[PDB]
RNA sequence: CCAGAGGGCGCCCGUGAUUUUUUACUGUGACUAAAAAAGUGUGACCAAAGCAGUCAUUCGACUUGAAUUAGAAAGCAUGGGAU
RNA sequence: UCUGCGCAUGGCUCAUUACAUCAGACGUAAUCUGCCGCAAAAAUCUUGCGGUCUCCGCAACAUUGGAUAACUUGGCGAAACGCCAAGCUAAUACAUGAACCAACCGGAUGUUCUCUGUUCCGGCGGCAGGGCAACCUGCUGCCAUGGGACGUCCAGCGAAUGAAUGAAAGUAAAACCAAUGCCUUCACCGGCAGUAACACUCAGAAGUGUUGAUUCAAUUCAUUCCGUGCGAAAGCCGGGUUUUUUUAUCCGGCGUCUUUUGACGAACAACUGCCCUAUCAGCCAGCGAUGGCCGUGUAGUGGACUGCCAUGGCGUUGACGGGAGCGGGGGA
């Protein structure tokens, strides 16, 4: 049992300093893990800057003014992972968090339609009392599951005010993917060949726009859509392309003139 | 039926947990070419069962081929050193080591005490391939899959 | 007995403070069922049953779906079968009684 | 297949809805000679959805009808002979011809199956009167409370069916 | 302080390990339950999940099952006869899993009657069936040999099975 | 809703080696917390430091920035055929 | 002051400690897991009125029950984060307990009656004569494919034990009787064109779980569960109404019992690696040392432990013993 987290045992992706206290908030058990997530008070304070310090944060949160997934959240700390939607009425802002190139969390801004749309992977599929089929994901169960039954590793489309499930998408060649984990995340690609190694980690081989193809595992893959015109959701300014270190550097120089 | 005297030697009666031997008018088929009823189990990881195990006579609750022992993790090789004991064989391994300062190699052995189903009977100096398991004895943590 | 209200019939007590006028202390009543209480309680078990029935509704729709798929399957693999068989047959025997 | 609205429209509202539904977001309404339209969205899921949904349809006073693609088929259940069938009536043990008796002749019929408790009988066109008694009930007759009803299927076709069956058989053997 | 570890034991090399730690509640034994014949007594304890278990003491009553008839019915354990762990356990009339004991027989005898309209069923069920002669002699006489297949120190009940040809002959020949 | 007939591909299983073959080695990828180390950017008045901050005469713009690398032995995938 | 939650975290220190710890890489199908996330839940003869025979008739939104602190009264003790008798009263404490409303699906059955046996050769018998009830004889009823109605007992979640399920994937055309379906006929006449399943009510209301692998998930049947499991807290607060403040009027926010599985954790196992010493060469079984069999114990795996049986295990590629020492990221 551990109730304390510290600044040097916390991820780099939150971008907290070495200095300025020796403690960081430990998010609770929730829809997502401790080693990837962004906790509430970290978002509000250190990003959107509607809080300057700890007291400020809870003086927002505890009044029910912040809502991930349509449910108001009183708690100071509570994790928010990949592919969630944060809606704070008072401003008129809406976020859909995501990863972006350089492996680091990013924030999109979305309108009406996509403030009710989400996506969910499938981790496992199992059977419960009365022969009722069940799925399990990151965030939550939810029950049965047609849209038409099928299989693990596939990706659904979930609506949050009520279920209207548009279809789903599967893991098959020529489709499109965004990545998590593995120091390869914040990219986007196609799906070429998937190697299967029994009893052992399963290795995928991918591609992306204008070549520079690559590879990862298969539990770091999260499907997005059939094609890159077929996407249900919006994406950052970068389209999941890494470009070379030298290219980047050079460009930053040339444009700095102002 | 009447009872063996070469599969029985113990104070208690030797039987398989899995399946109903009391059987009777047999409801089938579950059974092995064709013969009295028997339990046999197809483990994966790209290994294929012995012919022998399926059609066997023997009663073992530690082999993965007729019991609920599961083979899961690490997968190893080695050769045989000594056939002693009852169902418990002894593996030797050999492999090298590298010291950065000298930039030269060195030889070392380990050894392991593994389980051998009565289905196999491998001789000293034969190769073998084995599998990871839950503790079946104080030392014993592996079980044979496949002989060479 | 019953129908007779005990809000009326509470004990009162009284306390002095010199030149600050008195106050009558008397107790709140607990384990008390009003109008509000009864309504609230009853309401719960209406919620309860409803939820159950929703489950059953879902289940029906699921089952129905599966069976419709299986139905389509049957039909499709009839068409295929029937066509193959009786077209090849048509050729065969018709031409041996036209011979 | 593209589905078929019927029992609307005439019509100014006809024309209006016709060019409103074209050409997206889905759908478009291809207006037709009389009171009906073709409604084009087609796909195997499309034919199922299109039934129970009623956007892209208007009425001017009319009651809507959603009909399969061709204008053919509904007249066959409606009319032209009857022919009638009766359900409570055992295979198992209670005999057939109680059936025939009940309707006072005009023959041909069978019981079906080992499943369950209908029989089927042709009393031709005049069965319109017979069923209008027994549908409005109709009780026991070594059976149970019942219902009778119709649609045409065969006759006429059953006789020509078994004819063309026997023909095939003789050739075959 | 009863412990379950390899710490107090020797190495495979005949050496001896040195500790640097006390002992935990993670490792934990508790003293054996010895479950005899007599009126039901129970001695509930609590485990490491907050889940009780029921240490049984003295059980005279049972539940026993045919294989092949696919039933189970009650009975009363009468005497203990054979145990293969020790002869100690026999003499004390204690009960452990895979112990061989004696039962009332009555409910089985009863039920096998039934193996109006009923009169047809008693033909159809009795057809395609025989009962062992081994089993027969026993069942008649009013006592049977049965085997407890439950662990009756951690559930506080005894349940069992019943012995047909193979198993049965292996036991009888001891006696 | 161009049929019959062989072809060809994608999944799944079963049967077949007169004995099927493998590692060290090396190429390219997988996997692997910070602090520290290496390193890109930035006039904290230089500096040791720190991840900041710079413009705009306005109720904000940078769709701000916080790159990148290394990490014995062992483990994992896939190429090479000399020693 | 009662109640609920937390104090097992954080802080501080390196004494013990070399198949020990620890780092890299793996495993738990061998396991437990409060708070938190998401999701479920159709069991139970209760209450009021009237009479009384114990048991009934008549109604329906459950007017539940018994205690104990603070406080007061007497106090005791040298002291004591020591204590006693009596009198008072609470609950989201503790203890009870909810019909109809409220469904789907299956079992076992009645000497229930009515479609019926179209149905005899055998069976079950029921009676008398000889009756020793062995049987022979004569007499007699019912049954020998079945289905409809009516009645009775059982059925939930979770847990134990025993059966069954938990797909298959290695030859090709006819006749035989027992059925039985469909054609077909006045016909229960004699042949195979059509043909998911199947006795109505439901003409598709699961013929189809995941994994490299399961004695797993889940399903069906038979027996069981007694405190050591299962309430709608018999709970709390708002807001709009209503007109009497003061409605069974509607709406919302909290809180809690039980079940299921994620990650916050815990426990267990070990593929590879690490100072000095041979003036440390044999070390391990009476008192478990290596393995085997049935058990016991534990959350679970195991010589973890009992009983019984074998004679193994390790080592000059440094065992065993001793000396120095918390391990790693890292610093000079």
UniProtKB/TrEMBL annotation, chain A:
Instruction: State the GO CC annotations.
Output: cytosolic small ribosomal subunit
Domain spans labelled KOW: 170-197
Q: Name the keywords, alphabetized.
A: Ribonucleoprotein, Ribosomal protein, RNA-binding, rRNA-binding
Q: Which Gene3D superfamilies match?
A: 2.30.30.30, 2.40.50.740, RNA-binding S4 domain (3.10.290.10)
Any single biological process term in GO: translation
Query: What GO MF annotations does this protein's record show?
Result: rRNA binding; structural constituent of ribosome
CDD domains xref list? KOW_RPS4, S4
The question of whether Cytoplasm is a record keyword is answered with no
Residues annotated as domain RNA-binding S4: 39-102
Keyword Ribonucleoprotein assigned: yes
Instruction: Give the PANTHER family listed for this entry.
Output: 30S/40S RIBOSOMAL PROTEIN S4, SMALL RIBOSOMAL SUBUNIT PROTEIN ES4
Family of this protein: Belongs to the eukaryotic ribosomal protein eS4 family.
Q: What name appears for this protein in its UniProt entry?
A: 40S ribosomal protein S4
Task: Record the organism.
Answer: Trypanosoma cruzi
TrEMBL record, chain B:
Task: From the record, give the transmembrane residue ranges.
Answer: none
| UniProt xrefs under InterPro entries | NA-bd_OB-fold (IPR012340), Ribosomal_uS17 (IPR000266), Ribosomal_uS17_CS (IPR019979), Ribosomal_uS17_N (IPR032440)
Q: What are the protein's UniProt keywords?
A: Ribonucleoprotein, Ribosomal protein
Q: Which Pfam families match?
A: Ribosomal_S17, Ribosomal_S17_N
Q: Name one GO cellular component term.
A: cytosolic small ribosomal subunit
Q: Which GO terms describe its molecular function?
A: structural constituent of ribosome
Question: Out of the domains of life, which is the source?
Answer: Eukaryota
DNA damage as a keyword of this entry, yes or no, is no
**Example of a GO biological process term:** translation
The segment(s) forming the Small ribosomal subunit protein uS17 N-terminal domain are 8-76
Gene3D superfamilies, alphabetized: 2.40.50.1000
Family annotation (PANTHER family): 40S RIBOSOMAL PROTEIN S11 FAMILY MEMBER, 40S RIBOSOMAL PROTEIN S11-RELATED
* Protein family membership: Belongs to the universal ribosomal protein uS17 family.
Q: What is this protein called?
A: 40S ribosomal protein S11, putative
Protein's organism: Trypanosoma cruzi (strain CL Brener)
Q: What is the lineage of its organism?
A: Eukaryota, Discoba, Euglenozoa, Kinetoplastea, Metakinetoplastina
TrEMBL record, chain C:
Its protein name is 40S ribosomal protein S6
Mind listing the UniProt keywords for this protein, alphabetically? Answer: Phosphoprotein, Ribonucleoprotein, Ribosomal protein
Task: List all membrane-crossing ranges.
Answer: none
Q: Name one GO biological process term.
A: translation
Question: Its family?
Answer: Belongs to the eukaryotic ribosomal protein eS6 family.
Q: Which organism is it from?
A: Trypanosoma cruzi (strain CL Brener)
Gene Ontology cellular-component terms for this entry are:
ribonucleoprotein complex; ribosome
Please provide, alphabetically and separated by semicolons, the GO molecular function terms listed in this UniProt record: structural constituent of ribosome
From TrEMBL, chain D:
Q: What is this protein called?
A: RNA-binding protein, putative
Question: What residue ranges are annotated as transmembrane?
Answer: none
> Taking every annotated instance into account, which residue ranges of this chain make up the domain RRM?
1-71, 82-153
Q: Which GO terms describe its molecular function?
A: mRNA binding
Q: Which residues of the full protein are shown?
A: 76 to 248 of 257
Give any Gene Ontology cellular component.
nucleus
Q: Which UniProt keywords apply?
A: RNA-binding
Statement: the UniProt record of this protein carries the keyword Magnesium: no
Coiled-coil region list: none
């Amino acid at each position: 049992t551990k109730k304390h987290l510290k600044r040097l045992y916390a991820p780099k992706d939150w971008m907290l300093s070495k200095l300025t206290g020796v403690f960081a908030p430990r998010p609770r058990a929730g829809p997502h893990k401790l080693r990837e997530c962004m906790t509430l008070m970290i978002i509000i304070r250190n990003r959107l800057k509607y809080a300057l310090n700890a007291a400020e944060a809870q003086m927002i949160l505890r009044q029910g003014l912040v809502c991930v997934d349509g449910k108001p959240r009183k708690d100071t700390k509570y994790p928010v992972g990949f592919m969630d939607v944060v809606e704070i009425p008072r401003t008129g802002d809406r976020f859909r968090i995501l990863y972006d190139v350089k492996g680091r969390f990013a924030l999109v801004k979305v309108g009406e339609a996509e403030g009710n749309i989400k996506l969910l992977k499938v981790e496992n599929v199992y059977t419960s009392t009365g022969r009722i089929p069940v799925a399990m994901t990151h965030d939550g169960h939810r029950i049965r599951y047609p849209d038409p039954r099928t299989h693990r590793g596939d990706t659904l489309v979930y609506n949050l005010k009520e279920k209207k499930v548009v279809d789903l998408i599967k893991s098959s060649n020529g489709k499109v993917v965004m990545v998590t984990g593995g120091a390869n995340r914040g990219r986007i690609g196609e799906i070429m060949s998937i190697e299967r190694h029994p009893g052992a980690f399963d290795i995928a081989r991918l591609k992306d726009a204008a070549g520079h193809e690559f590879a990862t595992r298969a539990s770091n893959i999260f499907v997005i859509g059939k094609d890159m015109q077929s996407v249900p959701v919006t994406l950052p300014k970068q389209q999941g392309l890494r470009i070379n270190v030298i290219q980047e550097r050079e460009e930053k120089l040339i444009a700095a003139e102002a | 039926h009447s009872v063996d005297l070469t599969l029985q030697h113990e104070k208690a009666y030797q039987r398989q947990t899995a399946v109903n031997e009391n059987s009777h008018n047999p409801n089938k088929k579950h059974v092995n070419m064709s013969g009295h009823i028997r339990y046999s189990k197809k483990i994966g990881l790209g290994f294929k069962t012995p012919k022998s195990a399926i059609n066997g006579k023997y009663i073992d609750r530690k082999c993965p081929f007729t019991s609920d022992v599961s083979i899961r993790g690490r997968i190893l090789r080695g050769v045989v050193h000594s056939t002693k004991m009852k169902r418990s064989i002894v593996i030797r391994r050999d492999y090298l080591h590298f010291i950065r300062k000298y930039q030269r190699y060195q030889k070392r052995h380990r050894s392991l005490t593994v389980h051998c189903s009565p289905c196999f009977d491998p001789k000293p100096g034969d190769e073998v391939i084995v599998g990871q398991c839950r503790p079946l004895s104080k030392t014993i943590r592996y079980n044979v899959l496949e002989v060479v | 007995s019953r129908g007779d209200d005990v809000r009326k019939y509470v004990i009162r007590r009284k306390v002095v403070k010199e030149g600050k006028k008195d106050r009558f202390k008397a107790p709140k009543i607990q384990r008390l069922i009003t109008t509000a209480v009864k309504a609230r309680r009853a309401k719960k078990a209406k919620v309860a049953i409803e939820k159950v029935r929703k489950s059953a509704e879902e289940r029906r729709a699921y089952l129905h779906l599966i069976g419709t798929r299986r139905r389509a399957a049957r039909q499709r693999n009839s068409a295929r079968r029937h066509a193959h068989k009786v077209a090849a047959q048509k050729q065969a025997l018709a031409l041996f009684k036209g011979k | 297949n593209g589905l078929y609205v019927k029992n609307w429209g005439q019509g100014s509202v006809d024309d209006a809805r016709a060019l409103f539904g074209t050409a997206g977001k889905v759908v478009g309404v291809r207006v037709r000679r009389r009171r009906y339209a073709i409604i084009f969205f087609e796909n195997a899921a499309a034919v199922k959805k299109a039934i129970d949904l009623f956007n892209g349809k208007e009425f001017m006073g009319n009651v809507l009808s959603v009909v399969p693609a061709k204008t053919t088929p509904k007249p066959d259940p409606h009319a032209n002979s009857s022919v009638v069938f009766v359900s409570p009536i055992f295979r198992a043990s209670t005999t057939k011809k109680q059936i025939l008796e009940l309707f006072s002749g005009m023959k041909v019929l069978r019981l079906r199956t080992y499943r369950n408790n209908y029989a089927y009988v042709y009393l031709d066109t005049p069965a319109a009167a017979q069923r209008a008694v027994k549908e409005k009930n109709g009780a026991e007759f070594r059976g149970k409370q019942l219902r009778v009803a119709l649609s045409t299927r065969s006759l006429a076709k059953d006789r020509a069916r078994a004819e063309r069956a026997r023909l095939l058989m003789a050739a075959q053997k | 302080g009863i412990v379950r570890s390899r710490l107090h034991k020797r190495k495979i090399t005949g050496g001896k390990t040195k500790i640097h730690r006390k002992r935990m509640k993670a490792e934990l034994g508790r003293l054996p339950a010895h479950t005899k014949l007599g009126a039901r007594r129970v001695s509930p304890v609590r485990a490491r999940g907050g889940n009780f278990k029921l240490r049984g003491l003295r059980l005279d009553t049972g539940n026993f099952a045919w294989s092949t008839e696919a039933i189970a019915q009650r009975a009363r354990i009468l005497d203990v006869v054979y145990n293969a762990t020790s002869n100690e356990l026999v003499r004390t009339k204690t009960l452990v899993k895979n112990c061989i004991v004696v039962v009332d027989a009555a409910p089985f005898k009863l039920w096998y009657a039934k193996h109006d309209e009923l009169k047809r069923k008693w033909m159809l069920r009795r057809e395609n069936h025989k009962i062992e002669k081994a089993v027969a002699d026993q069942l008649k006489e009013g006592r049977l040999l049965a085997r407890i297949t439950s662990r009756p120190g951690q559930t506080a009940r005894a349940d069992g099975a019943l012995l047909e040809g193979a198993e049965l002959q292996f036991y009888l020949k001891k006696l």
